[PDB]
Design a binder for this molecule. Structure first.
Ligand SMILES: C[C@H](CCC(=O)NCCC[N+](C)(C)C[C@H](O)CS(=O)(=O)O)[C@H]1CC[C@H]2[C@@H]3[C@H](O)C[C@@H]4C[C@H](O)CC[C@]4(C)[C@H]3C[C@H](O)[C@]12C
Ligand SMILES: C[C@H](CCC(=O)NCCC[N+](C)(C)C[C@H](O)CS(=O)(=O)O)[C@H]1CC[C@H]2[C@@H]3[C@H](O)C[C@@H]4C[C@H](O)CC[C@]4(C)[C@H]3C[C@H](O)[C@]12C
Ligand SMILES: C[C@H](CCC(=O)NCCC[N+](C)(C)C[C@H](O)CS(=O)(=O)O)[C@H]1CC[C@H]2[C@@H]3[C@H](O)C[C@@H]4C[C@H](O)CC[C@]4(C)[C@H]3C[C@H](O)[C@]12C
Ligand SMILES: C[C@H](CCC(=O)NCCC[N+](C)(C)C[C@H](O)CS(=O)(=O)O)[C@H]1CC[C@H]2[C@@H]3[C@H](O)C[C@@H]4C[C@H](O)CC[C@]4(C)[C@H]3C[C@H](O)[C@]12C
Ligand SMILES: CCCCCCCCCCCCO[C@@H]1O[C@H](CO)[C@@H](O[C@H]2O[C@H](CO)[C@@H](O)[C@H](O)[C@H]2O)[C@H](O)[C@H]1O
Ligand SMILES: CCCCCCCCCCCCO[C@@H]1O[C@H](CO)[C@@H](O[C@H]2O[C@H](CO)[C@@H](O)[C@H](O)[C@H]2O)[C@H](O)[C@H]1O
Ligand SMILES: CCCCCCCCCCCCO[C@@H]1O[C@H](CO)[C@@H](O[C@H]2O[C@H](CO)[C@@H](O)[C@H](O)[C@H]2O)[C@H](O)[C@H]1O
Ligand SMILES: CCCCCCCCCCCCO[C@@H]1O[C@H](CO)[C@@H](O[C@H]2O[C@H](CO)[C@@H](O)[C@H](O)[C@H]2O)[C@H](O)[C@H]1O
Ligand SMILES: [Ca+2]
Lengths: 229, 229, 229, 229
């Protein structure tokens, strides 16, 4: 129909999508003043009020551009995100956790969707991830096998650090980033277990070698693309 | 006029600008001995005295080379800097803060202006910054959205770290550099909030992925320029 | 013989090796639930039972594919690994240390052997190591010479950090990763030994210069290979 | 003369220089067992005895190869080093400091001189340094100007960290490596000086931008050489 075209040249319009970018920037400043108990005690009304207006508008416009583009709307990753942070946001307060009240702030990520220069650079960042998969595979297997070892070795005398398989995972991740791996983790262990450095000096070495190579992978792959294009 | 040319071939002279480089190096050694309470108690007079002589000379010469080059002086970034650290310096003591007394030391950055090899390498460093803008954009939006979350989640029971939106920003920046993110920030939070690692392990991951890519961006862009030039 | 070919087209089969990949994934989930004292108190029987079944199967199949390929089996690094983590695993409990009971978990690294995409990426990582050898040589010599110095200088008044040649090695390695090198190591030393920063500021500088170059070595070597291939 | 050629084909011989490599490796193992108070109490005699034999041999051979090559010996950086760690070593004990007794261990760096594969990789590492000079220049000027500021701002209430111009330099260097810059340096300062992060968040930013670029400089320069050669 032609009323269809009337609605498409509204919704595909520059001004329509530019308007909801201003609605994004407005609701980001509001989002930020909500973290002020002073502001909320004066303008807590006008503010949360403004937060409900922007959410109906995004649902009015997610129903509108779900109509303009019908099923094609759903094979698009960026539209799915706008649908799934509008709806994560669409849940009302005092229902569920507060964790949903805070995840409503995820709707600021609609700025990355509605802005072109931003969906470009995010396309770059995710374009990189297919290549990293084999090393992130190898990498995980390593953290798994070494978390099992570390729990079996240390989980009984250092339970806050190696009790769970998970507690072990976390500490190891922490050690990988060299966050206090020595004065804080390994040195305290050599007070009970003297040859513990045999477990962590190998460990530090291997995940640092693999991080270097993961990054050289990003660097050469990109260079190869540039060279071939 | 020809008295104009007399003043231009003075001010565009090698010796003129080389002389104010020695005045820079002299006033840097003086600048440094001023931080010695011993030195200041003997030669505090001769010293601050020397600091007032170099500042009139730079204003004599900023009035001179503002005359030689008239308006063109102002469309030049390096001359604006010399004008704005001479004048930040031109404010007298006991007026305002001490923060202006110390910012007078910024006039040592005139060494980067008056030396060619130095304005070259600074040109390299700033030439890099136009490219970084889209990722620094994305990056900020992320720190904002996640500071709001983190205040809403933790600002009441950990007020020194998540009370303000700003307190949150700082801690997050701190966590990004892996400065005691674990034994110091996240582990203390898991004493009250057990599933806090769900907020920071994602967070550490995303800003490390984006830092890697920002740096691979610098590396490939530069490589591309070299290849095409 | 043709019974030989009957056994080879069994053992070189897709399904045979795919089956022992499922046996790997099964014995990894089991491996992981063993670290649960709750799980072990109910299903400790069924579980360790399952661990003995998978080890006979791997020895049945290491005797099988040592037959199919006879001596060639042994000039292959990945088969040697499967032979040496099956046999490290083949030792029975209550004989030796517990350190062998835990190293049995190394048999999960059979997933990297039995999966193609995984032996590829490990081939990449080890392919990189021949080049790094001269800098790892230089590097070690440096840690040695500087551990000897550091013990001679500090081992008597700081025995937990510089008593052994080994204690010195460890601390230095720790300092190299910038793990609390300052508030934790060097600042406490400047309470007794004031000009200690002369030993560690040079040291931090040299191993950071050499790490940068080691990584630029990986990056240019790989780039050169890409360019020439 | 021909006795000259007799001495040159001795000193330029493979076996001559290979022999003093074994003397290097021997005196490195000895060097290392000297840090053992147990070893020194049994074999302290045989050991230090061995240390005096190797030093006469190196002076016999530094007088020999100073004769074979006369003045050309001195325009060679690697021979100057062998002359200046033999002579730093030639000073006798109980004269001067112990700091000279320990610097005798520097003579192990003769292994890098006497081995070809080693003087190669050190040639690589130093070949890189001419390029880094302009950024290390800019870099220093920055640490200087900002150490002066930081002493003027904080040296009176935090004297162990900002009292000297030097104390300031050290702390800043420490902050640059992100070693406890937050929970340890800047957070304690915001207890007295609340807007201190304005001094260090800019500071952390600028030296991290410049480190990234210094390393991209190494990476592209090397790539350019590879491409043009
Ligand atoms: C395109 C990219 C790499 C191919 C390429 O040309 N670039 C390098 C991607 C596309 C498909 C990817 C793999 C598969 O999805 C599954 C595979 C099995 C592992 O157990 C776990 C992930 C693995 C390693 C993936 C990583 C691998 O990297 C592939 C080939
Ligand atoms: C030249 C360089 C990139 C183009 C290029 O060819 N190099 C890559 C620079 C020049 C102009 C830059 C953008 C605009 O100023 C604004 C824009 C909007 C964002 O919301 C915030 C900043 C954005 C992303 C900027 C970054 C972007 O990077 C551009 C294109
Ligand atoms: C192939 C690779 C480098 C050659 C190349 O073309 N790539 C760079 C590998 C192959 C053989 C390697 C050396 C020798 O095994 C021993 C040698 C003596 C040292 O004391 C200790 C290790 C050294 C430096 C090794 C490193 C060196 O890197 C070589 C040449
Ligand atoms: C070869 C290399 C760079 C040239 C090149 O082609 N490679 C890049 C080297 C060789 C000579 C170098 C400079 C001078 O010695 C002094 C100079 C003055 C500064 O105040 C302090 C150091 C500066 C910046 C040095 C760094 C610069 O980097 C040069 C050009
Ligand atoms: C936009 C969507 C993004 C989806 C996120 C995808 C995540 C992909 C994982 C990549 C992140 C790796 O995670 C991060 O790796 C860095 C690598 O610098 C490691 O960090 C450590 O390793 C490096 C090696 O490079 C050490 O030299 C360094 O001292 C330290 O930073 C940590 O292990 C982890 O903090
Ligand atoms: C001359 C004028 C200069 C104007 C300044 C322009 C500033 C531009 C911003 C670039 C600086 C980024 O700021 C800095 O990023 C580094 C990236 O190494 C991060 O630092 C961290 O991230 C890296 C990833 O590379 C981790 O692997 C690593 O363990 C840690 O160093 C921090 O987040 C921050 O300290
Ligand atoms: C798959 C089999 C693998 C066999 C393992 C082979 C090991 C080869 C050794 C390479 C590992 C080097 O070991 C690791 O080097 C990193 C380099 O990032 C150093 O780590 C440090 O150096 C870097 C320089 O890049 C600093 O800028 C940084 O703040 C810090 O991470 C440490 O010294 C060590 O943790
Ligand atoms: C063989 C003779 C050698 C002569 C020595 C020549 C020295 C030349 C100076 C290069 C060394 C720079 O010194 C070192 O720089 C590293 C850069 O990784 C910095 O270290 C820091 O900066 C990086 C940026 O890359 C941060 O992202 C990172 O978290 C941290 O490691 C420190 O400021 C310092 O420890
Ligand atoms: Ca730290």
């Amino acid at each position: 129909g032609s009323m269809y075209l009337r609605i498409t040249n509204i919704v595909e319009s520059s001004f329509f999508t530019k308007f909801i970018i201003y609605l994004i920037v407005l609701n980001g400043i509001t989002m930020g003043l909500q973290t002020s108990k002073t502001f909320m005690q004066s303008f807590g009304v006008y503010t949360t009020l403004f937060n409900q207006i922007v959410i109906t508008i995004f649902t009015i416009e997610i129903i509108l551009r779900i109509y303009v583009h019908r099923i094609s709307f759903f094979k698009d990753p960026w539209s799915l995100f706008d649908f799934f942070v509008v709806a994560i946001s669409l849940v009302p307060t005092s229902s569920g956790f507060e964790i949903l009240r805070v995840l409503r702030v995820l709707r600021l990520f609609r700025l990355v969707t509605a802005v072109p220069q931003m969906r470009k650079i995010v396309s770059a960042l995710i374009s990189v991830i297919p290549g990293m998969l084999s090393v992130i595979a190898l990498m995980t297997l390593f953290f798994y096998i070494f978390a099992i070892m570390a729990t079996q070795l240390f989980g009984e005398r250092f339970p806050e650090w190696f009790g769970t398989l998970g507690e072990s995972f976390y500490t190891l991740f922490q050690v990988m980033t060299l966050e206090s791996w020595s004065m804080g983790i390994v040195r305290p262990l050599m007070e009970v277990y003297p040859y513990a450095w045999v477990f962590f000096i190998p460990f530090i070495f291997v995940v640092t070698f693999v991080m270097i190579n993961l990054v050289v992978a990003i660097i050469v792959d990109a260079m190869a693309i540039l060279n071939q294009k």
